Amino acid sequence: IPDLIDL
Amino acid sequence: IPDLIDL
Amino acid sequence: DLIDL
Amino acid sequence: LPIEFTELVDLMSLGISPQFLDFRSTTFESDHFVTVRETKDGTNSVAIVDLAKGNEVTRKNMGGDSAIMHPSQMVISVRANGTIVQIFNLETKSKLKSFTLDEPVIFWRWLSETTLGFVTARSILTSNVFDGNVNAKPQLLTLRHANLNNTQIINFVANKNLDWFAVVGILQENGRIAGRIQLFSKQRNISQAIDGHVAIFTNILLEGNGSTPVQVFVTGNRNATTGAGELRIIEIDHDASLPSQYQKETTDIFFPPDATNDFPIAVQVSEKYGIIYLLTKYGFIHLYELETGTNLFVNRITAESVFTAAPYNHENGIACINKKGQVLAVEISTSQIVPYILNKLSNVALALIVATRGGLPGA
């Protein structure tokens, strides 16, 4: 699943 | 269930 | 009971 | 006089809209960070306020609709679709956890530095977030019991040993807020239903016990039928090597007649000084001495509704957030507490108890 936040 | 703590 | 409350 | 009362930050001053300054969107796991979930034109975002760096604000879009910070580290936990949880270290960029729960999360909070707690519609779970098993689901602690039925879950607390737990729900009953607590002992695998709005597990050094604290559970209640407030303090899990036991204590919590819908919203304790800080939703601060349960002080620090709170200043005080976005802190004055007890409470014995426990001046 896509990361819920992109760091 | 309503948001009781914020009433 | 677990505790006196 | 016996307390220091300060403002840590004004959240509206940082540009946070009032619609997000409430229990739904703003979390306060410790005095280190305030996290506000926001939404704009369908897009979610997080404003992370770092109280340890001059209220520096990190603003990032995110895919989830709920986010909390770790008590001390730059570790964010994010949730989407009720069940999907991801946990990231903001410095190293590493993903610590990524899993899907069986049921939607309706409440979460850090229980300790190691362990994150979850409450669903029917279950109570914990995750060892730093154990390196990225995809491991939270472990079931216990099923919720019937006493939490039809409540809004507002807290989940544990002792440092992570073998005693309490989950707090509130419900409206005959136009007053009643509080229900599920207390759970992991060692006996047994729960007990008690009445209470607030709860914390803490420790106290008693004379005779050297450097070893005994454990106590502190809980505050307001009887939804009579209006009577009650604070209780009771020992848990006494080590038989320690000769001194904590004697159970019960004290009144006073509510004026016209504070009809008020109730305890938070309780924090200074272990070092043996001070209980109890806050109500209407913003009344109450101080009690931990050993005796004695009522020390009562005042009002805000007329705006409080919705959450945390320990302040190495856990020696309490900080809270109100619906105007003010983050307020109270802690005892170390130089004035003993004089106040001595002169204003006229209580020489209590003054000595406090002075001796804290290494404080004035006695």
Author numbering:
A (entry chain G), B (entry chain M): 1 to 7
C (entry chain E): 3 to 7
D (entry chain A): 4 to 366
Quote the paper.
To investigate the existence of binding sites present in Clathrin NTD, we crystallized the N-terminal domain of Chc with different peptides derived from adaptor proteins containing CBMs.
While these interactions are consistently observed in all peptides, an exception is noted for Ent5.1, where no density for the Asp residues at positions +5 and +6 is observed. Concurrently, K326 forms hydrogen bonds with the peptide backbone at positions +2, +4 and +1 for the Ent5.1, Apl2.1 and Yap1801 complexes. We find that yeast epsin Ent5 has the highest affinity for clathrin, highlighting its key role in cellular trafficking. The CBM showing the highest affinity for NTD, belongs to Ent5 and is characterized by the presence of negative charges surrounding the core motif. Therefore, Chc has (at least) two sets of binding sites with different binding affinities and/or Ent5.1 binds in a cooperative manner.
